[PDB]
């Protein structure tokens, strides 16, 4: 019977995830991804643990900043929903593509 | 059993001067160590390029001062110049 109006749980999840500091990706799938796309550069490498933790920190920070600039592009187009051409505009103004 | 030098005890002394009733964890001490090494290498490299542009062979306090004025923004740069000049004056007068 009780349901929230759509948008409310989105706003309180925004507050909940901007309050904390943790890793937001599972770490065994990320470790498998790193070892796989490192396998095409040198066969039988042997990572440490702090190397994979440093890569996960850097990747998470990059994606969060890209989503902030994407959100500003989508607000500039007088919308709310984010579309992939906003990502393309952000990465081309910034100087990456 | 091999030595590795850092800036831990000095950051601890400066913290016990500004806030006498607080502590610091190990991760934040690692972050402060990285910050001090970063700013050191940046100022030293700028002073070296000044000394190379002017065809001289000596890094002095005037090169360090001009590197600080080029690297830091305004109010922070003025207070840093004041602190460094006060330290050099108190070092030469206590020769």
């Amino acid at each position: 019977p009780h349901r929230y109006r759509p948008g409310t749980v989105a706003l309180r999840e925004i507050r909940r995830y901007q309050k904390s500091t943790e890793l937001l990706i599972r770490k065994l799938p990320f470790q498998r991804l790193v070892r796989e796309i490192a396998q095409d550069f040198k066969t039988d490498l042997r990572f440490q643990s702090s190397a994979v933790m440093a890569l996960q920190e850097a990747s998470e920070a990059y994606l969060v900043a890209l989503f902030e600039d994407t959100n500003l592009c989508a607000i500039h187009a007088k919308r709310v929903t984010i579309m992939p051409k906003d990502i393309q505009l952000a990465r081309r103004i910034r100087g990456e593509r | 059993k091999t030595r590795k030098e850092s800036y831990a005890i000095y950051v601890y002394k400066v913290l016990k001067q500004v806030h006498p009733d607080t502590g610091i964890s190990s991760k934040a001490m690692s972050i402060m160590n990285s910050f001090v090494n970063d700013v050191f290498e940046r100022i030293a490299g700028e002073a070296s390029r000044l000394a190379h542009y002017n065809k001289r062979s000596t890094i002095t306090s005037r090169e360090i001062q001009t590197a600080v004025r080029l690297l830091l923004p305004g109010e922070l740069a003025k207070h840093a110049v004041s602190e460094g000049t006060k330290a050099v004056t108190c070092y030469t007068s206590a020769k």
Binding site: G7, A10, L11, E13, I14, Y17, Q18, L24, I25, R26, P29, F30, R32, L33, V34, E36, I37, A38, Q39, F41, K42, D44, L45, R46, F47, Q48, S50, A51, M53, A54, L55, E57, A58, S59, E60, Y62, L63, V64, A65, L66, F67, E68, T70, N71, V80, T81, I82, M83, P84, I87, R91 | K27, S30, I31, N33, S34, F35, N37, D38
Partner: protein, 80 residues
């Protein structure tokens, strides 16, 4: 190996988008984001493996990752 770009699931991109501050998300953002992340990780892994091969080792340490990111223009405090 063919998977593990699929292992970055689709509540995880949602959580990253909400830390970014996003209220409503389309349904093509998922594949676009997976492409972006794979390109970034390839450019960092390549320089880390170059430093490791020059040092004549077989393990990728944390400092090689730090030096690679510092070359990219992205400093990282806390692992040195």
């Amino acid at each position: 190996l063919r998977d593990n770009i699929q292992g970055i699931t689709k509540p995880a991109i949602r959580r990253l988008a909400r830390r970014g501050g996003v209220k409503r998300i389309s349904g093509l953002i998922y594949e676009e984001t997976r492409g972006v992340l794979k390109v970034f990780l390839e450019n960092v892994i390549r320089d880390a493996v170059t430093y490791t091969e020059h040092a004549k080792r077989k393990t990728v340490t944390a400092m090689d990752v730090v030096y690679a990111l510092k070359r990219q223009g992205r400093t990282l405090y806390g692992f040195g």
